[model samples]
Target: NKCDVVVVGGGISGMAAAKLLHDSGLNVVVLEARDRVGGRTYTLRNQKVKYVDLGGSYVGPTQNRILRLAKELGLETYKVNEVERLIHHVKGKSYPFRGPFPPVWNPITYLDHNNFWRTMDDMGREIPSDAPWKAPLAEEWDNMTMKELLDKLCWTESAKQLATLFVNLCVTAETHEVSALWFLWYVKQCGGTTRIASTTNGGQERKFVGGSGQVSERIMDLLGDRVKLERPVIYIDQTRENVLVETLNHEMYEAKYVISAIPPTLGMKIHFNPPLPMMRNQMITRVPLGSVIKCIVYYKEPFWRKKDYCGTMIIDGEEAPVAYTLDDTKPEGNYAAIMGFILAHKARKLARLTKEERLKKLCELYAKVLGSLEALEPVHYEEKNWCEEQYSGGCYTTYFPPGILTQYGRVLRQPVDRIYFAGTETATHWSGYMEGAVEAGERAAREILHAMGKIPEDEIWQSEPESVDVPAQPITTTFLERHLPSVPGLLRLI
Candidate 1:
């Protein structure tokens, strides 16, 4: 088969790129390894809930790329409930807090905790969202681990533990495993630590009416026969003019250019005739996907709500396998569910256990923490062990360990001959989220267009609007405007 472009991996990123390329009057083909599309954003339907997203689910403010695209696709979004208090479970105890931060009694500990986030946000601002390696403190930060930074900055053990837990839950990797520079850059790309962590007007704030997976599935629907499933590209042989993509089934696709929209780690599996650049190869080896298992527990009702508790939980100690959870019930209140994330070492350890065993343990922990035996009997339990996924390798997204980002960061999105890279990791904003994937895909498509002399080079890194404009609303007076006396007439009336 011959086409203008062959997109490897039909995930959201790949599909987004193909959609743009096709819209530009280019013939594009999407080859997916898995039987389905949507990549990390997997939405499943069950009797309990109309639909549940087991992958990239949440979107909030500043994640405009996905939001705009979702709007374009006629999808509606609803905010996740946050009116009640959040539960902070430390070891054997639980504290209900009304805000984003955890519950801390000591003034000293509270100071340290506040300073931690402030320091992180300030540091993140210094790093360039597009080129983190170019930051003035890049060398120093890249040399250190998040754990090292936490140990140095946080005076209180409680502050350190809380910060570490936040890092673990966000990246789905241990603090000691990730580079300080990388984490700072990740936070900056998503509008800083507070936005990334907050639920109200933050990263975890909203949900798509159907599911995030629908974004890719809907794009695939528009692409029609352009997308081919269960076809994994094992080899790519590119010449000066054209490229040939060879799949595992011995099928061949010839294209003018290729966009490798898979994760960097997964890209290493494909055999390139002329091997990738040494730095790209080295970087690929260093980039590993984060460990995560997204689990959803269903119930007849949200039992925590009865106690005036919001469905958010953050576990500090080893008392439970889940690091974080959120109320995943439908906005209409038809279904009741809580989504739990078993991340980092917990995901690693729990992967060895049976699904039923892990679910039962999680239920028991929920029962103890919520002080409700009602949690012990869940209507159903479903989980997606992303590490076990043959195609994805892990959940969330891939990250740099320590030295990789600074050295090979330049080549991250730079096209290698006829091949371009596109994925959440390559995104300049919201790098590990659904918004990032959409942005990266569109950027890669623009790169290909520029290379083909279809667009100006300066337009490659253009920013997208949060939403498309419709009609303006007319100004109207409030009820108080008519009822209340004017400022000048108030004294005269009295």
Candidate 2:
């Protein structure tokens, strides 16, 4: 019941903070609401082949924090299978295109698509990664939604829909639901649109060898009994020197400092003694978690590989249950799977359907795209609808609505006396990612260490060491020779 620090939430972030503090000679206890420790990074072990990640899994270039941690844990990553070409299912047609750029049907759509990325990349550079609200156009950008920005920037309806699809895929939320300023800041933090959306050298480039869930369990092994499961923190009293935290069962833990590593909106469930600051309460109320249901269809073998297709498919219409998919086969090609997401409004629309029904629809849709009846006869199927999860209302991460960033953004990482916030959402780099979670957790621990005169002030926000392994760029032959006529190549040709 007594410790140097109490970390709420046993996810990667909270576990990370606890691990750091314990290593630094501080007695730390982690209180997790769920029975498991992984939080959003749940891995279903021995399913079909070996294990499959149902939550935050991928780690790639520019994600130095998680990569560093993974390296330290002796975990290896394999590049996703991006061999031949990517399939784009749009408007009742399927087009195969190479590289990160999507296929365009017309010249105008291509121009609009290119401009959208250019405009977003340019605007994103203006917003400060650490303090988005400090940007010159923060007031105006924060006041508008992503939909509003697309309506004004996009020239064609196709371009707008495509851009909207990207937003839905990334945040697991509709375009209108996210703040324009917040979206730009997020894209910028993850290293521009090209890096964030790419598979070969981008965010989704690689996944761990034994699934990401093991990372948390391994850290727990170090802490031993310090990490508690099913101990949902329901109350926090921080009026005195030591903060008092109460679990749902009336059990209490006293600590010199407290680190909250849960979602902002999830914090609403806990009662704060002396109450939280007005701006903090308002900020939490404004930030809503994006909805998603991750689904994976397992096959007997890597069937799509024979067709010389990279299983990277993007469905545009509402007819399909998923917005995007990727090749989820292991490095040895044992458990062949295609992973997809039921994102944003689509997740809500299908929330009432039975799992069997959703699986049936997804399989049929896969069969149509893959041009194989074998897809319908999958060996196994797994789906985790994060929207229905009690502790975590949704998946991916939370996003700011209009005016939230500029209005109360500063309080996101600002400590409230003895209470400090350490979650992926509070991270300045790679927010809403595993990398962000690790960075935030270590940062909170450093803050406490700094206060205790154990470390220098500059060490609190130290940049993570960069990865030396630079991934090879995606093949650009198709995009240059075929996809453009091609105007994009024409500009390069000129």
Candidate 3:
């Protein structure tokens, strides 16, 4: 017998979609490839109440869907603690920055950096967040990588390192790899790049009381056994009347419609009877996940805070394989923790090393941040390399390359008859964040309801992207790169 809808990949997006459809009295079933339901949002448990959020950590203002869902589930949130004196280790030297910005060490260096950042923001304002390719300069901008655009500005070496490091920290990819169009659209989607990177009122604001994964867990409980885990889907086909989904073990389930909520690349792996369009393949081919590894260094005491610091740290470890480290202790809780990240191509290379070996390297890199080599010995060490995760190829999120967006961005969420797309990547608003994931899934479910005439056309808000005017005057990255002391220990970037 067929169900109303079969939701694929039981991540937050899939589960949220299924829950909405189920609450609507439809027979929706969720099929998860992994043994768990949280997807990239996972928590490594230590004590009963306290645990390390190995993935998808922070959420705050503007990400309304996730906040509403968490509140409905009776969950709570806590603000990440702020620090006064933060440490910055850049170029084999340590500098105790007063606040967020590395005090404009050189005027020419700072001016050039701001100019380059300003140009990108101006370009972003030109593209509609919903459909970036519709912009007049889409082709021209999409043809170049972010690094290419930066190179054209004639930036200083210090400016170059800071810019590339910022990109790596945000997208988890090398600066030269990401398309300029994709970058601008990303900034625009979050209401400008400044809001995207802001700590006070922006993306790095707050987190759930327990962990980000709890949001999924609560939804999963509402779903109960309707979610089938440890079942990898190998094939999907829509045969006139119904959509048939087959598991790797030869089991089959049929539904009137299906919502595939996995990453684009993973979704492409499922064999379709009548394969997807060439444009879709072209889009999926260019869309690659960004690599990142999350490491939690737990300490018996919150030592950094006692030392007149907020335990905030940015290891200019740019000279090494890892990126940076942030204080991850629950200010009110008992234990203290610092989370370290190794991203992009470096993450791929680290995949060659053993997990234990990676942990050793992580500890060694932070030996000084802890004030001594002995401080490196944490009470516990929890690590998750998102790239090695069997299902999730990368963390933070996947992104588009040069020209892919302009050529085939439209195919990202275009339905194939009975099949639908729902995931963070497909979202219009907060793509690559938890907010985006929930929004995408909710949108997919609503589309299905509308398709069946359960929802009136006027009630549904169809895509109406506002055409934004580009600013004539030069915009600077001052607000963004300014006093960027701490971006809230984001071990879990949506």
lDDT of 3: 0.76
User: Which segments of candidate 1 are over 4 A away from where they belong?
Assistant: 468-494
Instruction: List per-candidate RMSD values in Å.
Output: 8.5, 3.4, 6.9
The CA lDDT at 180 in model 3 is 84
Sort order, TM-score high to low: 2, 1, 3
The best candidate by lDDT is: 2
lDDT of each: 0.86, 0.87, 0.76
| Model 3 Cα lDDT, one tens digit per residue, 178-252 | 998888898788767556654445666676767888888888899888888887889998755788999887878
The numbered model that scores best in TM-score is 2
* Model 1 lDDT per residue over 443-477, tens place: 99999999999999999887776553221122233
Q: For model 3, where is the 10-residue window of minimal lDDT?
A: 466-475
lDDT: worst 10-residue window of model 2: 477-486
Deviation in Å, model 3, residue 344 alpha carbon: 0.9
